[PDB]
């Protein structure tokens, strides 16, 4: 089997991407944030504290003839911005782009933090990291991909995120029309539960390539590109007037700037992030200071190849017995 679903930016800055997901019988369609940096599929629901719901579409398990309470199971998860959610668990039928999994753990939110409430466009998360990170207790649950894998034509999914435009998540096949040149594959460590890999270096604009190992994670659920302070300083030094602002929380730059590209290495191959992809717009409405899309990972504890990087590539998440990651230009 295979599946194919369009993923769409939630706003004009590509702050996140939503993908429609069918849950239950009859189908209830929710728009979920596919997150290769976590391993829980959770949704706003009829159980979510009413004051914490503001415009999201909810899953109502009592209206699904295939929903079953997973007795005794609870979940609780936190994210990189300090947001969090928690609740109980149902199993139900879940379909993505025509690919159906029966008995999928659907984590129903009883509580969500303010940032989730405040974002009416995201109805929940669908985790695509390794199932060892799943937070359901006392019996850990499998991700949608893990459950689907045996049925797939090939044990892979691909992320093809758009810049200010829709893109595609495919399951079970590689669309050879969706990229240019060849796909370069690179080793993955699953030791921390992430799609963790090592970039071979970087270049800023038309500058020379610096060969240096950068360990990080391929994370569709993180908006920006977080890299070591040395690398980030080298990038922003090429933008007149750019500076790190403790008050804003990162590098900012004059909105009048033309940003240089940023290249990262995948083995001997190179992925070029155009400068425009690194512009996240005014820090507040009407400001002439703009927020940068490349930020320091110092104090995060890990480097993160988030959407800024991934949307410049066609990315293969290869879930074979020994997982790997593939990157192609597009």
CATH of the domain at 145: 2.40.70.10
Give the CB-side neighbour count of residue 38, counting CA atoms within 13 A.
Answer: 22
- Same domain, yes or no, for 266 and 251? yes
For residue 136, CA distances in Å to 68, 73, 139, 223, 328 come to 15, 6, 6, 25, 35
Rounded CA separation 165/118 (Å) = 23
Phi, psi of 79, rounded to the nearest 5 degrees:
-125, 175
What positions carry a catalytic annotation?
A: 35, 199
Q: Which residues, listed in sequence order, are joined to residue 124 by a DSSP beta bridge? A: 43
Q: Which residues contact 230 (CB under 8 A, 6 or more apart)?
A: none
* For the chain, the helix, strand and coil percentages under 3-state DSSP, each to the nearest 5: 10, 45, 45
**What technique determined this structure?**
X-ray
How many beta carbons lie within 10 A of that of residue 215, not counting itself? 12
**What domain count does the chain have?**
2
- Same domain, yes or no, for 191 and 217? yes
- Same domain, yes or no, for 116 and 182? no
- Same domain, yes or no, for 90 and 50? yes
Burial of 111 by CB count in 10 Å (0-12 exposed, 13-18 middle, 19+ buried)? middle
Cα angle at 319 between 220 and 144, to 5 degrees?
65
- Same domain, yes or no, for 179 and 132? no
**Can you point out the beta strands (E) in 17-67?**
17-23, 28-35, 41-43
- Starting at the edge strand that comes first in sequence, how are the strands of the sheet with 225-227 ordered? 269-273, 262-266, 196-204, 210-218, 303-305, 225-227, 294-296
Structural domain of 306: 175-330
């Amino acid at each position: 089997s295979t599946g194919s679903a369009t993923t769409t930016p939630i706003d004009s800055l590509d702050d996140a991407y939503i993908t429609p997901v069918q849950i239950g019988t009859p189908a209830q369609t929710l728009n979920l944030d596919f997150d290769t940096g976590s391993s829980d599929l959770w949704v706003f629901s009829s159980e979510t504290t009413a004051s914490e719901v503001d415009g999201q579409t909810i899953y109502t398990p009592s209206k699904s003839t295939t929903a079953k309470l997973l007795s005794g199971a609870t979940w609780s998860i936190s994210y990189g911005d300090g947001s969090s959610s928690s609740g109980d668990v149902y199993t139900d039928t879940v379909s993505v782009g025509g690919l159906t999994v029966t008995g999928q753990a659907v984590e129903s939110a009883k509580k969500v933090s303010s940032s989730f409430t405040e974002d009416s466009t995201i109805d929940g998360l669908l985790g695509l990291a390794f199932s060892t990170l799943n937070t359901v207790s006392p019996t850990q649950q499998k991700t949608f991909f893990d459950n689907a894998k045996a049925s797939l034509d090939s044990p892979v999914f691909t992320a093809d995120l758009g810049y200010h435009a829709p893109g595609t998540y495919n399951f079970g096949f590689i669309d050879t029309t969706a990229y240019t040149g060849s796909i370069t594959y690179t080793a993955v460590s699953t030791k921390q539960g992430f799609w963790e890999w090592t970039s071979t270096g970087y270049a800023v604009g038309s500058g020379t390539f610096k060969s240096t190992s950068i360990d990080g994670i391929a994370d569709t659920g993180t908006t920006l590109l977080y890299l070591p302070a040395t690398v980030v300083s080298a990038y922003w030094a090429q933008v007149s007037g750019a500076k790190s602002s403790s008050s804003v929380g990162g590098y900012v730059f004059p909105c009048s700037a033309t940003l240089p590209s940023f290249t990262f290495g995948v083995g001997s191959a190179r992925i070029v992030i155009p400068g425009d992809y690194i512009d996240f717009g005014p820090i507040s409405t009407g400001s002439s200071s703009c927020f940068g899309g490349i930020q320091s990972s110092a104090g995060i504890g890990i480097n993160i190849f988030g959407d800024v990087a991934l949307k410049a590539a066609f990315v293969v998440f290869n879930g074979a017995t020994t997982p790997t990651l593939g990157f192609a230009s597009k």
